[PDB]
Design a binder for this molecule. Structure first.
Ligand code: ZN
Ligand code: ZN
Length: 582
């Protein structure tokens, strides 16, 4: 409590000494409330015209058009301390899982240099603008790093001054770039050295890519066992207990020297004790604090979510297999039984899951898992849109399992070779491509964002007839040599000016471990589509009059965009498709 946070508070209080007030109509119950001061400010989504002009049939689909217009009463909730038996299961599993993850990995500090290259090539690090404009500026200024060093030495001293969260089913807690650096220094290794790669963690998929997830779900399916379960948790970040944060901090037991001390500091001082500033239109800045829930960098968050989720799902598999009887109290024999489970079969049970942060697919030993709910509910990982004690409905077919907002089709090429391709509702794909994040975009930048989406569609979604044609139209309407961009950069192999058929061959054939025959594909017509009815089920406008007119007259849509952009060097990609090939 207040000895660890007070300094952070007293510093904010003093810089707004002409405003401080302990407001009495403060809405916080679950958050500790310390005071307020005067502010007045707010970034809305804009339409990408290049994409919208080349997807005219979708101008009248409400699912598309609505995406472009525009619970914080769930962040003010409170999870209960689990039973002692749950806490024992979680401590033992956490200990065993960090050992497994750390067997072929060395924890290590990340560097000012690594961090500098990160900012200088636009990764979303969720920092704030103040004393410098962008993050790009502060990184080259030696004064910044002096501020970092002050705080850094403070952290080694066991205190904190400037590591304060700014609030904004999503809620994004920004810190000043300096505190983001110190978080990255201590915990960046988890991401940077692929601790949750599938090879290293068995359950994880970090850096796998949308073209591998399908093959991974299919490999899980090949194991003997029950249905595939894919239960979403209701507001996962808000359900992270103090006990979860303490089990995550056990990664520091694998560390040493400066590192161990810095990592420990981040966990003690930013994670297990938070200070947050929130806007309130009643517009004042409220300085509230709490011990529990998730609030890290989007990227460390990803890794710790994956870690804790892996942990919960192993424990739920234990409950399914009757490794323990009650969560109220774990007997001494029930400890050794859990320990012996983890030693004997824990790696086999990890290979039964695909886990991406708060998202999971589990194929347990059998369907007893479906109603194994006591540990899962008592850890506070309460399932979304299902009664708390109602059993999980599993999937019989790996091609229906939802994972990372996708489903996966099995698709056989005219030469017999098998593609496992990602898919989702086409209204979702087209509606996202039509949105741009930020203001002050030139025509050229807007066109280059359009091209990023088109090249993604050609790489991941080539099997959808509307997306292949729209992607060819966008890549025909944007100058051939202009480089794809994106303002918050999975594997992203569409971010290139290389020939897209050459990237397709590298990703789907050459580098694809599930493809035994490495015969390159020579043109786009070798590359198959979903069945026509499958395509319509997944949202295709194939068969509609609007779409046939769009398809027939596409060269006129391409020319409209060409005319707006101007006299540049353009390539016609529409002859890559049979119907436009004369
Ligand atoms: Zn700090
Ligand atoms: Zn589909």
């Amino acid at each position: 409590n207040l000895d660890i946070i007070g300094k952070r508070i007293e510093k904010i209080k003093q810089e707004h000494e002409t405003s401080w007030h302990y407001d009495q109509d403060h809405p916080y119950k679950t958050w500790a409330y310390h005071g307020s001061y005067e502010t007045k400010q707010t970034a809305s989504s804009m339409v990408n015209g290049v994409v919208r002009l080349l997807t005219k049939p979708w101008d009248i689909i409400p699912m598309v058009t609505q995406m472009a217009m525009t619970f914080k009463e769930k962040v003010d909730t409170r999870t209960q301390e689990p039973k002692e038996g749950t806490k024992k299961l979680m401590k033992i599993t956490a200990e065993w899982l960090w050992k497994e993850l750390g067997k072929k990995k060395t924890p290590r500090m990340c560097t000012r240099e690594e961090f500098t290259r990160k900012v200088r090539s636009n990764a979303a690090l969720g920092a704030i603008f103040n004393k410098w404009k962008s993050a790009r500026e502060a990184v080259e200024d030696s004064g910044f790093w002096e501020l970092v060093d002050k705080e850094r030495n403070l952290h080694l001293e066991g205190k904190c001054e400037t590591c304060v969260y700014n609030m904004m089913s999503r809620a994004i807690w920004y810190m000043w770039l300096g505190a983001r650096f110190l978080e990255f220094e201590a915990l960046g290794f988890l991401n940077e050295d692929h601790w949750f790669s599938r090879e290293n963690s068995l359950s994880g998929v970090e850096g796998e890519g949308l073209h591998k997830l399908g093959y991974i779900l299919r490999d899980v399916s090949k194991k003997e066992g029950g249905a595939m379960y894919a239960d979403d948790t209701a507001g996962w970040d808000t359900r992270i207990t103090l006990e979860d944060l303490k089990n995550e901090e056990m990664v520091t037991n694998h560390m040493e020297g400066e590192h161990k001390k810095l990592a420990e500091a981040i966990f003690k001082l930013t994670y297990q004790n938070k200070v947050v500033r929130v806007q309130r239109p009643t517009t004042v800045m409220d300085i509230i604090s709490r011990r529990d829930q998730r609030g890290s960098g989007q990227v460390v968050t990803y890794g710790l979510n994956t870690f804790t989720n892996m942990e919960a799902q192993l424990i739920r598999q234990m409950e399914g297999e009757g490794v323990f009887k009650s969560i109220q109290h774990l007997t001494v024999t029930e400890e050794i039984a859990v320990k012996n489970w983890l030693v004997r079969v824990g790696r086999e049970r990890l290979s039964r899951m695909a886990i991406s942060g708060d998202d999971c697919v589990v194929k347990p030993l059998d369907d007893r898992f479906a109603s194994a709910l006591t540990a899962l509910n008592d850890m506070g990982k309460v399932r979304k849109d299902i009664q708390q004690w109602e059993p999980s409905r599993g999937w019989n077919d790996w091609t229906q399992v939802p994972f990372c907002s996708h489903h996966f089709h099995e698709l056989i090429m005219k030469d017999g070779r098998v593609l496992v391709v990602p898919c989702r509702n086409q209204d979702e794909l087209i509606g996202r491509a039509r949105i741009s994040q930020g203001a002050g975009w030139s025509l050229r930048e807007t066109a280059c964002l359009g091209k990023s989406y088109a090249q993604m569609w050609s790489l991941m979604y080539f099997h959808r007839r509307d997306l292949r044609l729209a992607a060819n139209a966008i890549c025909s309407a944007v100058p051939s040599h202009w480089v794809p961009t994106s303002r918050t950069t999975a594997t992203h192999e569409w971010m290139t000016t290389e020939d897209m058929l050459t990237v397709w061959n590298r990703v789907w054939i050459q580098e694809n471990p599930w493809m035994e025959d490495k015969t390159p594909v020579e043109s786009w017509e070798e590359i198959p589509y979903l069945g026509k009815r499958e395509d319509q089920w997944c949202g295709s406008l194939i068969g509609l009059t609007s779409r046939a007119t769009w398809a027939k007259n596409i060269q006129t849509a391409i020319n409209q965009v060409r005319s707006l952009i101007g006299n540049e060097e353009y390539t016609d990609y529409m002859p890559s498709m049979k119907r436009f090939r004369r």
